[PDB]
Design a protein around this ligand. Structure first.
Ligand code: HEM
Ligand code: HEM
Lengths: 442, 442
């Protein structure tokens, strides 16, 4: 029974229930649970995911110790979760020297240079995006952003990772769109993690095996974008190749479509921001010119908008590292096996660092005020050697979509639209109700 | 499915069955399974304990790489087994830096110096041993060695680890003898290791919890022999103290009584060895003199006898290390998570290194022939930084018993006695039928 651990270390925290730990307190969302705990306990506090002790830390210096300085030595790995199957080879799930190998093997794939060659191809789908939107916009009818954005981000990730060029909203039949489209239980495997090994020997996997096979076969026909870069330490393997691609599609799809939805909601409810953004796009790109790599990096306000949205909606919600060994960081003892958690969502809406945390104010990120922003408070992409390897790609992909979408259209709230936007209470950062706006042509 | 692993590495081995792996081949004893595999596959071979791949290695240079050179870096830990509970803190079960701490904290307790202070107290029980034996011997009746030896080794371990002086064969009521005396399922948790975490969260433990409590309480009344040495890196803890003692009693009891039984069986079936041993004891210790520390270390033949018995009956049977990371030792790749196993029993009865391996011949260990004996073939106490920490104590304890027993008695086979001795087919090196001999007074 490890439920005495925090009270044995003098660390405050909500009293756990037996077996359950604190998970019942997730009933309002664990983001709301983190903020509440931050408010009532201060800088450090402990709670239990079933029998798993989790130490929340909010000190910026502690966060850097954990994310940067002591990462290879102590805090290398995320929380084991599963059942996972062959996806244990995925970089985001791999541990210690295996993760190190995959990070070293995958780093050159996510440089500025490979992104600059990807901008022309991902631009092709900005243009389909505008057409499908123009259609759903000419309907005069409120549009579901997650359906045109979910089609776009889909369209992008497949061609950048396998070169397959499809319009998911209009060729909804290509087996590659089919397979890729397919991708309550979480609640249970946190209070019953002793059951993960059972699901593992039963071939049970949270990733649909029905699909996975399709991919490993699609890789072999390509064996003679992301796939080539990997095909072209010790070298990667065939099945390893597939696990990494699967992680990329998940990352490319649900993050991008969700964030874009969040962006457009903020732009619709702040018309002045939307206009100012469009004026910047129109000045850098006269007469609806084609977005390019070098152009995107000149749009400061566009950058300020994405950053402030990511402040309000950091889709990772929490960063986590498992403590591999007894250690004493910044003046407190962390025992082996505790999960150290950085509550980014709560840190991004903390009044200690943010005046009016709940308002959407891109100027917090202006060249004037950006300097006052602590990189271990504001961590939408994490930090240290295990940060979001696709951060530059994600921002380019979102920005290229935003540019082309705003060059052609404006976004107003509908009688439908949920204002204020509410967040889903699940385990993913997404709107409760889908975002829908009036889209007018410029 | 990891059942293709060995055939994927080019490593021969018996074809596994699904889920079961090779465990059905344990039906004749896994010692017999190791010898058979050694005979049909050669120096290296792989098999599966359910889904756990095990690589058997017999090359002396490979064995040293695994046991000595690469121990801290790769092969630090034994196979996880359980459910274990608080006994995960026991040194023999602990892993990586925790094991390192306990090994460093326990090493000074097992020196020559602490043994020399223990010889007088453990001598007191050689004398009870002779009395209870004399009684069971004056019965004229065949004697069950494991009952007088099991009482002695019991009597020794309790006073050397808690100072409690009892005659287990005649004060069979003292709560300390009671509790300590109390200490099919193995078959199941090797083909269902995915069930160990379940038994863990159910407080289920292979070590009777009914007992364990008694001990941790007996430690606190002593908190104000082994216990003091520990009470008297980072310092040890109270519960940690108890887990280590429990390991010592298991080690002190079943190893010593079993080996002594094996010894006396060999001495009874080789009267010339027994006599020659008694002549040595009588010359070093005239007129049934008291065995002492310095005296024991002068009895070369006594030493040769124990060593040859340990060759025939190495109670550990196998040494094991888990491979912590992909490595390539002595010209072959070992993947992470494989259990590397040294089949000591089979290596001790291999004709490559042993002329007439099945005969009991103490002269193999004579100062003449001892030099030709490879320390990575003959490994009754293992090797490297994780070897048997109580080896010197075990040999002294056995030898002091043997000396006093042979000074007073001789041991002949009975109509009962099982000749040839057969080995139990369980998971412990012990006689099938208990050893019983005629014991005559000298
Ligand atoms: C707005 C979009 C995205 C955001 C906000 C985001 C954020 C994050 C965060 C916060 C982490 C954990 C970092 C940490 O623990 O310190 C992470 C990990 C990761 N991200 Fe992203 N991500 C995004 C999109 C992407 C995309 C599009 C890809 C690839 C196509 C990607 C690839 C990864 C990988 C592979 C990891 C695990 C890295 C490792 O363990 O070495 N991400 N991301
Ligand atoms: C004839 C008697 C004994 C024999 C043949 C024996 C043999 C062994 C062997 C073969 C190992 C594993 C070594 C390896 O993996 O390299 C071992 C481990 C160990 N032995 Fe013994 N043993 C005996 C008695 C004892 C006694 C009496 C004690 C203590 C009271 C003891 C304490 C230990 C411990 C604590 C370990 C685990 C060490 C670690 O993991 O650091 N042994 N023993």
């Amino acid at each position: 029974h490890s439920h005495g651990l925090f009270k044995k270390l003098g660390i405050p925290g909500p009293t756990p229930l037996p077996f359950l730990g604190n998970i019942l307190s997730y009933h309002k969302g664990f983001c709301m649970f983190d903020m509440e705990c931050h408010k009532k306990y201060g800088k450090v506090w402990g709670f239990y995911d079933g029998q798993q002790p989790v130490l929340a830390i909010t000190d910026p210096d502690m966060i850097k110790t954990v994310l940067v300085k002591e990462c290879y030595s102590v805090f290398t790995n995320r929380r084991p979760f599963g059942p996972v199957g062959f996806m244990k080879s995925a970089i985001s799930i791999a541990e210690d020297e295996e993760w190190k190998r995959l990070r070293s093997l995958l780093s050159p794939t996510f440089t500025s240079g490979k992104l600059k060659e990807m901008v022309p191809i991902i631009a092709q789908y900005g243009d389909v995006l505008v057409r499908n939107l123009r259609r759903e916009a000419e309907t005069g009818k409120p549009v579901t952003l997650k359906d045109v954005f979910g089609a776009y981000s889909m369209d992008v990730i497949t061609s950048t990772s396998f070169g397959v060029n499809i319009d998911s909203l209009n060729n909804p039949q290509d087996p590659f769109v089919e397979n890729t489209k397919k991708l309550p239980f979480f609640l249970s495997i946190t209070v019953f993690p002793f059951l993960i090994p059972i699901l593992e020997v039963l071939n049970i996997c949270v990733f649909p095996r029905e699909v996975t096979n399709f991919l490993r076969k699609s890789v072999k026909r390509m064996k003679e974008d992301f796939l080539q870069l990997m095909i072209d330490h010790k070298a990667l393997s065939d099945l390893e190749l597939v696990a990494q691609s699967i992680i990329f599609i998940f990352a490319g799809y649900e993050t991008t479509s969700s964030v874009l939805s969040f962006i457009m909601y903020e732009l619709a409810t702040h018309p002045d921001v939307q206009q100012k953004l469009q004026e910047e796009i129109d000045a850098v790109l006269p007469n609806k010119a084609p977005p390019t790599y070098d152009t995107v990096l000149q749009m400061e306000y566009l950058d300020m908008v994405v950053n402030e949205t990511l402040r309000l909606f950091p889709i990772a919600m929490r960063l986590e590292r498992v403590c591999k060994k007894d250690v004493e960081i910044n003046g407190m003892f962390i025992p082996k096996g505790v999960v150290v958690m950085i509550p980014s969502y709560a840190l991004h809406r903390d009044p200690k660092y943010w005046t009016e945390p709940e308002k959407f104010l891109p100027e917090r990120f202006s060249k004037k005020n950006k300097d006052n922003i602590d990189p271990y408070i504001y961590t939408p992409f994490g930090s240290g050697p295990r940060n979001c390897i696709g951060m530059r790609f994600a921002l380019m992909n979102m920005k290229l979509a935003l540019i082309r979408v705003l060059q052609n259209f404006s976004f107003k709230p509908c009688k439908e639209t949920q204002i204020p936007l509410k967040l889903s209470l699940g385990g993913l950062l997404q709107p409760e109700k889908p975002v829908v706006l009036k889209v007018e042509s410029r």
